[PDB]
Structure formats: C-alpha cells, structure tokens
C-alpha cells in the first residue's frame, strides 16, 4: 500500500484501478505546466485547452474566492488577455484598473454612457437584445409575461428608433407611463399593433408587459446616455478591459442592468469574426446573483471560436437551482469543464455531497493485513463531503477539464496595490 | 483501538483516516482558546474568525437555547460588542438592558418612535425598504402580489413624502381605505399612475397590492411615531444595543413589523462605512418565526466588512423549508458556518438525520479482534439517535473551518433582572 | 452475549455502544419514578420535566389509546390538574365529569352558552380569534380564501360589536345572507370598506370570504348563546375541567366549531399570567380529525410558562400530512417530545417504518460464533410494531431515557354521569 | 419449513410464517367464527376490517363467497356491493333487500328518506356528491353540495321532496329561475352578486348534472337505509348492477355505500349486532367521504368492512397517495392472492406489508444474522390461483393457504326485468 499518501485523504492503497486520480498540488502543477504562457488557478497553471471550456469556482464566503479570481485575472492580464469583470464594490477595478479601461456603473462619474440602442446593428438584434434587457422569468408563467415585455419593448424601441427618438426615457415613458390607449395608439404601425388589442386577454398581456418593463427599465433610464457599444468595444483590439462595478447596497436595484450587460456580452461575442488569437474572459462574480440569463448557455457552448473564457462563482447548489430551475441549472453548471472546490459549511450537507460527487470516486486495491495479507477491491470518494466541510480557508481542490487528476492546493494571499479608486461618486 | 473513547460515541478505533473529528469538550475549549478577548458558545470560546461567519443553533424546545444565547450575549457585551436582539417577551432586555439601550415594541411605553420613512436617505432606498416592509411571498404567486404591494407602497410613500405628509396613517389610508378611484387619482404623477390602470389585469394587480398592504401595514400605523432611525443608530458608536421585544400572544400580529425591523438591519449594515473595529450581533431568536426576509441572505454573505455576526435559532428543518422553500432554505442555512446541535425529538427522525449528516461522517481503521484484523469503516460521528437521546443542556459544537466537533454541557448561569421586561402601562 | 434478553427483540449482544437504549417495562418504571406526584403513561410514571414537552400517542384503532388516555387523565385528575378534553361521544365526561366541570356541545342540554365574541378583550383579539374561527386552508389557495373570510369576519364582527348587536345570527346573516350590495354597504366605515370593492378581483375575494364563512359559521350560530369565556375559564383556578364532547355522527358538521374551541385554548393560554403552579392538559383525541389549527404550533412551543401539556393521538402519518401538508405536519409532530407507539396495521408499512425510525437505532457489539462485530440496527423493527398485540406499547419519553415495551392494564371506570343529554 | 427462503436456526423477530394448518388452529375459537380462505377469523379481528388484495381470477370471488356464507350461517347481516347480482343469486332470501334502479325487485329510494335531522342534509349531500379527485374538483363538489342541500331542503318544505323536481331545478331550470327559487334559502346570496358567484353556481350545476341522473331514474319510494339498519329483522342488502353499466351507476352505488358508512355511526350501541359491508372493489367506487370514519369508528355499531384491491395505483389515483395510505391503513387484516409480473411495485408493497423478519442462520462450510422478506415480491407474482397469504390483525403469524372452490346453488335470479 504505497499510494495515496500526501494526496489521498483516505487509507493508502497498493494499486489504483480506475476513476478520479488525486495527486499532490506540486505534482499537478508539474503536469499542467506548459510551454506557452499560462494563467494560474490556485497557483496551478491552467491547461491552455481548458481555458475556453470554462471554470466554476464553488465555495463558501471567505474561503479564498477573491484570492483565486484576483490571481486568475492578474496572470491573465500579464499575458495581455482582455476581460469583462462583473466587479462588486469595484475591488478588481481598484487593483487592476488602467486608464484605457472601461467602467459601467450608472452611479460612477467615470462610467461610459450607454443604452441598448447602441448594440443594434441588424433587425434580428432587436429581439436578441430585448432578451438581455428582460431576462428569463423564474417560472413558466413569469417567462410568459417577460415574453410580452420583450414584444412591447422591441416594437416600441424599434419605432422610437425610426421616428428618430431612440431614448430610454421615451421608451420608459411609452411602455410604463403613457395611458393604455396612448400606448396602443403609439403601437399602431408596429408588429404589436393588433397583438395587444382586441380582447381582454390582449389587454391582460399588455398589462403584464407594462409591469415587467416597469421593473427592468428604471436603471436603464437613469444610466448616463452615451455612445459606448459593448459590441464595438469587443471588436476594438486596444479597447482594454471592461469593469461592471456597483455598490453592494445597490445589488437588488442594479440586478437587471448588470444582468443585461453580462448577457449583452454573451450574445455579442457570438458575432465576433473568427480570430484564433483572441482571448476574452468573462468574470461573473456570483452567477446566482444575476438574473436568469438568456444567452449564458449558448456563450458557454459556442464561445470557443470567439475565444470566450468564463469564470463564475457558486456557493450552494440550491442558489442556482432557484434562479434557473433544477434542470437548467444542471445544464448550466455542466457547461463549465473545470471545477475548483473551496470548501463549504457543515450546515450544507447537500452541496458538500454534490461537490464530493463531482470530484468523483475511484476504484482501488488495498492490502487488508492480519496478524495472529489479503487484497480488497474498493470504490470510494476521492474527497468525502466532510473533507470539504472541514477544509481550512485558502485551501482548494482543483479539478481541471479532461483527463487530469485533482489536487488539494493552498491559496497564497498575494498583495495588490490599489492603483485606482474603486468608486467615484458624482453626476 | 486506544483512540476515540470519551469523545466518539461509537466503538473506539486504532486510527482516524479522514472526515469529521470529534474531541472532548475540554480539548476543544483548549483548541479554540485564543489570546484575543472571545465570546463563548456552550462554554467553548468561539474562534475570532468564525464570528463573522455566523452561528446556527438547532434544537428542540427547552434544550438550552436560552442558556446558550444568554451566555453568548453576555460574553459579547463584556467585550463591549453592540447588538440587535429579536427578544421574545423581553427576556434578554430584563437581563441585559441598560439605560442607553433602545427598545422597539409598539406596545411598550419605553419604545422609540419609528416609521420606515426614517430610513430613507436616497431614492434607491424606497424599493430597498419596501422590501423590508413587504417581505417575500411564500409562493411565486404571493410574491407577485407582494411586488404590486411594494410598487403601490413605494410610489404612494414617495408622494406623501413630497407633499410634506410622510405619515403612516395617511399611507395606510390611501393604500387601504381610500376608494379605488381616489387612489388612482392620488397615484397620478407617480410611476404607478398608469401601471395600475387601463385594463382588468391592472385593476386586479392594484387590488392585490391593497390586500397585501392591508396585511403588513396595520402595526406600522399603530407604532408610536418618532424620529428614531435604525440606520443612524447603526452609525452611532455610542448608540447602545437594540431590543426588539414583544409579547408572545401577539406574535402573529407583529410578525410583519418585527420582520421589517430585522430586515432593515440586514440591508442597512451593507451601507455602513468600512470599520474593521466594528462588531454588531444580530440575534434572531427563531429564524423560521419571522417572515421570508429579503435581505437576510445578502447580510449573511456580505456583512463581513460591516462586522455583522448573526446568531439564529432553528428547530425542524421543515419549518424554514416552509417559509423560504426547500431551495432558499438550504441556501440560507448554508450561510451559517458554525453549528450547535442541541438535540431534538424522537418524533422528528428527519431533522435528526439532517443534523447527524451535518455533524458529518469519518473514515476510521479499527481492530476486529478474534479468539486480529484491521478494517476500514465510514460512519456518522453522531448518530441521529444520539441527537434524539441528548439530555437537556448538552450540545454538539461544530465551529466553522477545520475544527473538530465536541459534545459539551451547558451551565445554567443565573442572571439578575436589571430591567422590567415589559412596560405596557395598564394598572 | 448477556445484554439484550428480555428487552431487545433482536439478537442479544455483548456491549451497547450508542443510540437508543431499550429497557424492560419494569426497569423504565424504576428510572422514571420520582418523589413528586406523577401521572402515568401505560403504567409508567411520566417524568415531571417531560409533561410540558407533550405526548404523542400513535397507534391503530383498538390498540388501547382509550385505555392510555383514560389512565393519563385519571392520574392527572388525582393530582388536581385541570384539563380541556376533546371528548368524542362524551366518554371521558361520563367517567370523569364533575359537577363543577364545563361542557361545550351545541346539542347537549348541559352545554355552556358561547360565541367567539366572549373571547375579545383587546383590538388584536379580532384577528387572533378569527384565526380560530376560520382555520388554515388545506392548500395555499384555500388559505387565500380563508384570509378573505377572516377579513370579512373580523370587520363585520368589529362593527356589529360597536353598534351593540354582537350576535352570531346577525353576523352570519350579513356575511352570508345579506345581498352583495347591502353587505358592501354595511362594510362602509370599516377597514374592509375599500378592500372588497373597486374591481372584479375585489368582488371575487368578497365572494370567496362569503363561501368560507358559510361553511365555518353554521354551527357557531346554532350554538346556544351565553356568557361563557374560555379565557376567563382558564384564569379561574376553581373553574374545573372542560369537556368538548360531540356525537360521532356529527363529526363533519362540528369539525370547524370544535377546532375553533381547541384553537381558542391554544392562543388563550399564551395570554395567561405566569404561574409556576399551573398545569393545564389539552387532550386532543385525534389531532388529524381537527382542522388545520393556526395556534397549535405556538401552543406546543410557548406554553411552558402557562403550564400547557398537550396529549394528541395519531394513526397514519399520511393523516396529519394531508391536513397540514408534509412540511408543517413534520414540524407539528416534532413538537411532541414524548412518543408512545401502540402498533399499527401491516397494510401501513410506511407508518410502521416512520415509527420504527422514530423509536431509533442503536450501535452495538456482538459475538459471532467467536469474534466481535459492530452493528447498527433498529431497536424496534417495523414488523415488530405491525405485530404488536393490543394493549402493548413502546414508551419513549423525552430526553435521555431508554424506551420500553409495556402492557396497558384495562382499568375499569364507573359512569359517573350521562355522556350525552338531550 | 413454512418459510420460502433458506432454512434458519433461530427466528429473532418480525413476522412469523406458519403452515396453513397451524394458523387455522391458532385462530380457531370456541365462539362461532367466520372464515377467510378457510382460516377462522379471530373474533377480535372482525371489526378491524379486511383488505383482500389480488389479481383477476386469483380467488377473490371464492374468498368473498366463503366469508359471506359462514357469516350468514352465524346470523350476521350484510350490505353487499354485488357486481352482476352474483351474491344475490347464491345467498338471496325473500326478506332480503335489493337496490338496483333497473331490477324489478328493487326498493323505492331517494336520499330524502335518510333525512331525520337538519345536520343530515350536509351529511347525505356528502354521500350523494362524493369527494372530488383533485382539490379544485372538491371545490366544485362543495358548491354542488351547497346547491343540492339548499334546493332539497326547500323542496321538502314546499312539500315536494322530489328527485325529479330537484334535478329539474338544479340542472334544467334557467339560471335566473334557479336563483329565484333560491331566495329564502341559505344559498340565496352565495350564488349571486358577482362573476365568481355565478361561476360557482355553474359548477354546482355541472356536478349535480353528473351525480343526479341515476337518482332520478331510480324507482322512488320510502325505503330508508337508516331504518333498515335499525330493524333487526331487516335482512341483508344487495346493491347489484350489470357490469356494462358500472360507469353510469358509479355515483349511485357510491352514494349507497357512503350512506351505510355514515348511518351506522348513528345506531344505538348494540354489542349483539354484527354488520358486514362487502365493498367488492374499493377502487371502483368514487372517493367516499364517510368510508374512513366508518373504518375507524364503526366498532360500537358492529361494522365489519371487507374490501378488495388490485394495484396500489388504483386507490392512489382515486383518493390520492396520502388519503389512500390512510384508507388502506384502516383495514388491519390482509389477504394477498397473487398478482402480475407486470406489477413489480404493488408486488413490492404487498411483500412489504407481509413483513420482514430477522433470522439467525448456520452457514455450513458459523452464525449469521439476516433481515429478509418473509414473502418476496417474486413469490407473490408467481402465486398460483386459489392460494393466498393470510395475515390477521394483531400479533399473529401469516400463512400461505389454499382456497377451496365450494359450489353454491342459485337460489334467486341475479337480475330481473
């Protein structure tokens, strides 16, 4: 039994048959090290091929996610990669913000002016981006109302754009403030003219649309108007990085707007002309803190050519499950091929079981000694749920995509100088 | 097998491989003892780093939760910590109430005057605190109604504030007493002017909003009006402590108001300027007795910088599950990194299993003697039956991080009544 | 293997490691026997500290629940305890009814006069007791209607009380017989004036309230009126005991009224001034036969100061699950710290599993002839409960106490009064 | 040697299985008994009911025939839900009653005959309008019961207690006309005043239109099932019907079974009385509102229910999983006659009901403690016809016993007219 020491937490064994291999952090760093310039995850160099297959970092609060994403971004920037960072409190901005970099925050004096009208190029872009502005509903019923919201939104905006008045204040006024008869009058000449009239059901549908827009649009209206386009930004090689920041006491109010930006990035990258040299990271702080994104799924599945790399954080399995629903949450999570398990709470035995199961089992041969020698085949978890619940901070399991063993690795708290103010209030 | 006895309830073993470690109460007290001034949980000093990661105390009635919370509050006060205490019957008030301390109870002569208007500073605070006044609905449909209630609430309140009459009596009158047409008229000029008019659905929505508000607002109206602000209180270093008390025969009536106050604390601490020295405790007596709090989750996840420490009590898993729903209840519980299991009823095998699972399993090597062989075995450190048969004033303490759990006895410290629990005013 | 024999039904063992301890009926009686005067559960003296933590008695029909509750009530009376007894057919009344005792039954000549109005003291009592009159809806939508029903009830009642006519006959007429417009007119001046008007939805809600009230109020109207107040009765030390009796062929008709009475007691004891000496028992014959009580949960958790002790009967887990819903039924059952299992049907393998799991497992060391083995097992298998002979029960008291299989003695009680009159 | 698995060296605990011979001797009693598959039924198990679970053609007819027979030889009375008047033809007597809207021998009846007190109107509207399958269907059933009782109370007042009139008013008369007929009744304003009230009344109408048709066609009269229950010399009741009419008559037959269920709860205690309720196929009736209470409170009255079931899913679909479980739990004695290989779930449920045992066994090359099913699911799926596992209430072992096909002479025409 000369295996599973300084790697495996269970009993050492004679021979490993099949399943998940677990190695020491040092040996994994040796296996994943590559010729080319790499990025690092918990000190471990990330396999180049694994980058575009995404990374999911699961762990409790204060277990080292900041340290991890912070190191991922730094090593990515050194390599000259570009990136969009969903940055709470502007922490990433304070430490990695350069002068050529962009900032999106309706309450930061340094923000660029924007409105979804700036992303419209073709006619098929109206629905495409109405999908970003109005994220998927939690329930089938709510997604029905949202559908009405999008029909009202794209047709109202399409017209405003035509009559030469593409303003969010005008759009918010029509879809939310104008009387029912005036809105219906304005809708005359658009594809929504008769769909929202003629019966009590059509009226109910319109009412649902109004309520949905009155919830999503407010922050789009207060957002400083300008000509910045995330699409164009994505096309500009010297555009720098984009920081989507916001104060934590404003999370609920800005959830729809920030979801909208994250989603605009998700569909937009699908339109980028093939470029083998492009590497763009999407740092979604806490995935379950955003609304139910319409384009995230396709971006995690068809972003390889555009060079999209997504890094998202997750805490409890139930969080995402509640936002996307069990089935879609499973589909979403399965779209990140690389996983990092930072350890959870003893009070969440279910998620610890989910992460333990994800890390995987192995089949092994062990010597069952007796004293007055027998070989036993045994299947066991490489990482027990309890080992996850008992992990000390700054300690993570790294399971890269493909045929790679996992490893328990410690996180180094690198210090970063604050090269920019996180938040600059003003008007 | 010279290891485990005196600590582990099962058969002693030769070697501990992995999983949850169980130690003696005494050895744990020695491991968690720290140089800095600490607070104690069931006599065990709580690791300083575990404090801002919250504590979940689970147990049946009369198992010693009072003794535990009482000791935790006492040792915290000795250290000079500030705290908000959801205090049923004013028990904590009578034992720890000082003269400079605050009391919130619509029926106590000592109460401070308050209305949610006192918490509004910026415009984004209207929705922020409407979320506190109208907690999350139990079902998706009920949350739909609650959403209408908040729209009506925040828009009617915003106007009343403008016309100089920010009174709850007025707000309650408009949203509940005024005729439909009069309300609609009053709403003219507000963002809700057209949302609640123009169709049967809009009228239905408005009706739902009225019903929701007629349910939540009553006690806000009866509450003695004044200038007290929980936000300002949180900012005042010499503000003392806050005791949210109430008579148990008025639990159902005050559930919405008390939930509002608890939630106000939860969002508000997210606006506090970073102060490494600040330590605020939120003692939520019985978490599942409050409504579905909208800000609890974020407060449990982003309150570290503000120095928030939450201590909540729970009994049956099904209780919180019914209030928040299985998914959100899981996420909520998972936010408390430290757990204390006080033992439940034999008539609740499911919760005993949940607590047993939470305490965790361990993998161990044991000698199976014969008339000698080594065997590897995985088992629960604490069986469900051990929890059901726990004697009162006995608890399992499992602190956050890499620490062993321990079965510890609770000492019934005696506290002198330094203040009357309830000052109703009637002869 | 010396340990086991005469206590544990499985194979005898060498050493007990952890879990549920099972002892002999006699050894349990010795352990629970105390100096103070006690009550008895299946012949076993109930620990004093366990009483206010409630007792749940689970078993099929004819397994001896009557014998058990009868003995409990008797030894409690001998001790001078007061009690409310949900009494099907007036059986407990005929055996234990005293002259100073109270009877609540719309169809018995000895009943006291009552209306929920007699329970109102403060303004917060209208909602408090509307919750007693209109129990929780089975489904979330039914509770929506029940909410409308309580709003209509408390507001129509609050007004009738103000204009001097607090009669259930008037209330029932307004909430159910008066026309929509007349009712709407009556509601003017009340907090429900605008809530039930102005839209189709408000009208739908009002219609729902009427239907809910036409189902719950019928029996409150036929109830002989009088001045009896359960709250006042709870405060009177010399009030005696309360017997809520009814004929079993009127179960469905009186379910709402009896549920209201049991609920009234449940919130009311929470208003009682702390009295360390008070000991009130609430005998709820069959918990799942009552409606979804709004205050039971709190009474089971906050009635310690008031000295409330609840004893409830239950059969199949599915019964309570269907009334409260699986989540609240679990919370409710989890509120009774002491359990008594009387043996179920073999056609109910789920409940026998539930009870078995509730009786618990133990981990033990046994000799296998010779070597030592560690084993986890159910102290009481589901089959053992299904095959329990009548008048045999497993008594598992709260706290750190072992369980025990005990036989119930069929004590004979003389009929001291007619069970039903008129 | 009676157990199907490997023989053991010591039975520790659980369900015991004995030979059919030993069980029959164990349950045999001095007092006259009734037999279940040739096994004398413990006198104390009788009022705790019997559930007979089995496939089609496995012996249910034989079993129920022998039980009804031995019960008759003892003087017992019984209400028998009798498909195709099979029981009637074999055991019918001149004094015996018959309820069948299409048989010339039927008695005259309308639920009006059961009303003696004001609390009976709701009591028997429950019988006439069985519980709805879903919560919403039970909502409509509720409206239909409010409408029924209020319209019937008025009709009886105005001296016209007619099912034809009732059916006309609740199903045929116009909306407004109905409304107007409802003034002066408790239903007066509940069904008027809004769109919800109308929608509700409309539902009530639909429900009644489904339940009442066969009550109207039923030959009217003065037969009262309550009075019959009270008359010691009333004989036995046979509720018969042709199988090609099961769906059409499900409402009526269900009503009669429910009427029996509530009505015995009103009977003055009589330790000498013994009444059997033979509910052929429990899941073939509608969801009975009173059945559960009859099974739980009919001891004093002397009620003994014998019900048949097949697949677990059948009752589950009628009463729902929760209520079905409660219902099956009310029957303390069980009989498993053999099922289909295609039904592994019910076979497992029956296997689980027969119980497990913990046994000590010699593993010849030491001891070994094993928990196992006394009767495996496969053993039930492979049972020959006329073979059954009998498991009586209380502490008694189960036994596999053979059903003997006795022949009964046709003493009466099963159907007439």
């Amino acid at each position: 039994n000369s295996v599973g020491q300084g790697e495996f937490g269970g009993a050492p064994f004679k021979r490993f048959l099949r399943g998940t291999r677990i190695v020491s952090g040092g040996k994994l760093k040796r296996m994943t090290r590559e010729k080319a310039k790499q990025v690092t995850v918990a000190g471990v160099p990330m396999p180049r091929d694994a980058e575009p297959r995404h990374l999911l970092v699961n762990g409790a609060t204060g277990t080292g996610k900041s340290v991890l994403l912070r190191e991922l971004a730094y090593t990515g920037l050194l390599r000259g990669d570009r990136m969009v960072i969903v940055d709470p409190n502007g922490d990433m901005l304070s430490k990695f913000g350069r002068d050529k970099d962009i900032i999106l925050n309706p309450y930061d004096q340094r923000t660029k002016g924007w409105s979804f009208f700036n992303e419209i190029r073709n006619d098929y872009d109206w629905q495409r981006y109405a999908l970003s502005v109005v994220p998927r509903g939690k329930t089938d019923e709510a997604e029905e109302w949202a559908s009405y919201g999008r029909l009202l939104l794209r047709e109202t905006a399409k017209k405003l754009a035509l009559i030469g008045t593409p303003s969010m204040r005008e759009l918010f006024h029509w879809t939310t403030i104008a009387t029912f008869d005036d809105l219906r009058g304005f809708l005359e000449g658009t594809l929504a003219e008769s769909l929202f009239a003629g019966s009590n059901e059509a009226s109910k549908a319109l009412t649902s649309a109004r309520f949905v827009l009155s919830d999503k649009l407010p922050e789009h209206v207060t957002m400083p108007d300008g000509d910045f386009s995330i699409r164009s930004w994505l096309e500009d090689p010297n555009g720098g990085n984009l920081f989507i920041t916001w104060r934590e006491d404003m999370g609920p109010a800005l959830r729809p707007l920030i979801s909208a930006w994250v989603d605009v990035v998700c569909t937009s990258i699908l339109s980028l002309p093939e470029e083998p040299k492009r590497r763009l990271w999407l740092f979604i702080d806490e995935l379950a803190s955003l609304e139910k994104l319409a384009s995230l799924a396709d971006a995690l599945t068809k972003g390889r050519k555009a060079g999209l790399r997504v890094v998202a954080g997750l805490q409890s399995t139930s969080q995402l499950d509640d936002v996307y629903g069990v089935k879609e949450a499973q589909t979403l999570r399965a779209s990140f091929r690389s996983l990092v398990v930072l350890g959870g709470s003893r009070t969440d035995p279910k998620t610890n079981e989910d992460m333990s199961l994800s890390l995987g089992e192995h089949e092994v041969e062990r010597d069952r000694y007796s004293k007055n020698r027998a070989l036993e085949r045994v299947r066991e978890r490489v990482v027990m749920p309890a080992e996850i619940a008992n992990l000390p901070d700054l300690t993570a399991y790294v399971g890269f995509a493909g045929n790679r063993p996992i490893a328990k690795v410690p996180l180094e708290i690198k210090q970063f100088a604050n090269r920019q103010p996180a938040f600059v209030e003003g008007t």
Side-chain angles (χ1 to χ4, degrees), chain A residues 328-373:
Chain A
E328 302 178 73
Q330 181 194 315
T331 296
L332 201 49
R333 284 187 295 251
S335 298
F336 293 85
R337 305 290 308 293
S338 286
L339 172 70
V340 188
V341 182
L342 269 35
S345 177
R346 29 191 43 147
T347 62
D348 191 3
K350 275 170 169 290
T351 302
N352 293 332
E353 169 58 2
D354 294 346
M355 295 315 286
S356 166
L357 214 178
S358 296
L359 256 12
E361 296 199 322
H362 69 196
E363 263 228 72
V364 119
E365 283 174 314
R366 233 191 304 280
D367 287 328
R368 189 216 71 184
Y369 291 101
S370 179
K371 201 177 69 171
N372 289 297
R373 196 189 193 187

Side-chain angles (χ1 to χ4, degrees), chain A residues 186-244:
Chain A
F186 186 68
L187 291 184
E188 285 178 42
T190 78
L191 304 176
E193 192 195 318
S194 297
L195 291 171
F196 281 138
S199 62
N200 289 331
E201 186 61 358
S203 287
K204 178 170 176 178
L206 214 201
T207 292
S208 305
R210 300 263 265 177
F211 278 126
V212 163
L213 268 37
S214 80
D215 283 331
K216 309 307 162 191
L217 296 182
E219 239 53 51
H220 280 80
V221 179
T222 82
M223 234 285 171
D225 43 88
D227 281 358
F228 178 76
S229 173
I230 306 187
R231 303 189 62 176
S232 301
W233 172 80
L234 284 168
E235 296 172 291
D236 184 4
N238 196 291
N241 309 305
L242 204 189
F243 289 93
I244 305 169

Side-chain angles (χ1 to χ4, degrees), chain A residues 7 34 41 56 80 94 172 180-181 196 242 315 331-333 338 341 344 359 368-369 375 407 416 418 424 427:
Chain A
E7 317 177 301
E34 228 153 288
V41 177
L56 181 60
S94 284
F172 179 85
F180 232 66
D181 299 9
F196 281 138
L242 204 189
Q315 303 152 64
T331 296
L332 201 49
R333 284 187 295 251
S338 286
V341 182
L359 256 12
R368 189 216 71 184
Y369 291 101
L375 269 176
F416 294 92
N418 302 171
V424 168
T427 307

Side-chain angles (χ1 to χ4, degrees), chain A residues 386-399:
Chain A
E387 296 192 67
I388 286 169
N390 290 281
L391 279 192
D393 299 313
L394 304 183
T395 298
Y397 285 94
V398 176

Side-chain angles (χ1 to χ4, degrees), chain A residues 114 116 119-120 125-136 150 153 216-217 220 230 255-268 291-296:
Chain A
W114 179 93
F116 81 100
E119 316 296 349
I120 314 300
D125 288 328
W126 292 111
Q127 164 60 337
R128 182 181 187 187
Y129 291 111
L131 237 27
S132 298
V133 183
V134 188
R136 298 296 186 186
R150 305 194 192 93
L153 178 65
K216 309 307 162 191
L217 296 182
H220 280 80
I230 306 187
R255 203 162 87 104
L257 213 201
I258 296 164
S259 292
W261 288 327
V262 182
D263 197 67
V264 165
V265 171
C266 292
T267 25
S268 296
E291 231 124 301
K292 187 175 178 176
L293 307 183
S295 318
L296 208 240

